[PDB]
């Protein structure tokens, strides 16, 4: 497993720290979130360029991966999406 790092900027380790380790990392600029009108009514996975859930598999050990493999957006950390968590709440990591 290789970590791509040309020279974009910081790594996910910086962002993830500001949320619970049991929470899943996703970058999404939602209109509801941007207006602070979402307690649980926020979709993690939406459209290519707005919101997407990023694979948590690498995120644990490959946290050394810089944001170049991530979306610079209002970062959201949602309840750890394990198989069965069809609906959960998302909250901004860095706001």
Swiss-Prot record:
Localisation: Secreted; Secreted, Cell wall
Keyword Amino-acid biosynthesis tagged: no
GO cellular component: extracellular region; fungal-type cell wall
Keyword annotations from UniProtKB, A to Z: Cell wall, Conidiation, Disulfide bond, Secreted, Signal, Sporulation, Virulence
Example of a GO MF term: structural constituent of cell wall
Induction: Highly expressed very early in plant infection concomitant with appressorium formation and also abundant at the time of symptom development. Also expressed during conidiation and in mycelial cultures starved for nitrogen or carbon. The MAP kinase-encoding gene PMK1 and the wide domain regulators of nitrogen source utilization, NPR1 and NUT1, are required for full expression of MPG1 in response to starvation stress. The CPKA gene, encoding the catalytic subunit of protein kinase A, is required for repression of MPG1 during growth in rich nutrient conditions.
Domain of life: Eukaryota
Effect of inactivating the gene: Affects cell durface hydrophobicity and results in an 'easily wettable' phenotype. Reduces the efficiency of appressorium formation.
Main location: secreted
Disulfide bonds: 19-77, 27-71, 28-51, 78-90
Function, in words: Aerial growth, conidiation, and dispersal of filamentous fungi in the environment rely upon a capability of their secreting small amphipathic proteins called hydrophobins (HPBs) with low sequence identity. Class I can self-assemble into an outermost layer of rodlet bundles on aerial cell surfaces, conferring cellular hydrophobicity that supports fungal growth, development and dispersal; whereas Class II form highly ordered films at water-air interfaces through intermolecular interactions but contribute nothing to the rodlet structure.
Family: Belongs to the fungal hydrophobin family.
Quaternary structure annotation from Swiss-Prot or TrEMBL: Self-assembles to form functional amyloid fibrils called rodlets. Self-assembly into fibrillar rodlets occurs spontaneously at hydrophobic:hydrophilic interfaces and the rodlets further associate laterally to form amphipathic monolayers.
Domain notes: Disulfide bonds are not becessary for self-assembly, but are required for secretion to the cell surface.
Protein name (record): Class I hydrophobin MPG1
Record organism: Pyricularia oryzae (strain 70-15 / ATCC MYA-4617 / FGSC 8958) (Rice blast fungus)
Gene name linked to the record: MPG1
Residues of the full protein shown: 19 to 112 of 112
């Amino acid at each position: 497993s290789a970590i791509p790092a040309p020279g974009e900027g910081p790594s996910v380790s910086m962002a993830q720290q500001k949320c619970g380790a049991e929470k899943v990392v996703s970058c999404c600029n939602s209109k509801e979130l941007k207006n602070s009108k979402s307690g649980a009514e926020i979709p993690i996975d939406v459209l290519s360029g707005e919101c997407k859930n990023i694979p948590i598999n690498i995120l644990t050990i490959n946290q050394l991966i810089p944001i170049n493999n991530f979306c610079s957006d209002t970062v959201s950390c949602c309840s750890g999406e394990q198989i069965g968590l069809v609906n959960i709440q998302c909250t901004p990591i860095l706001s």
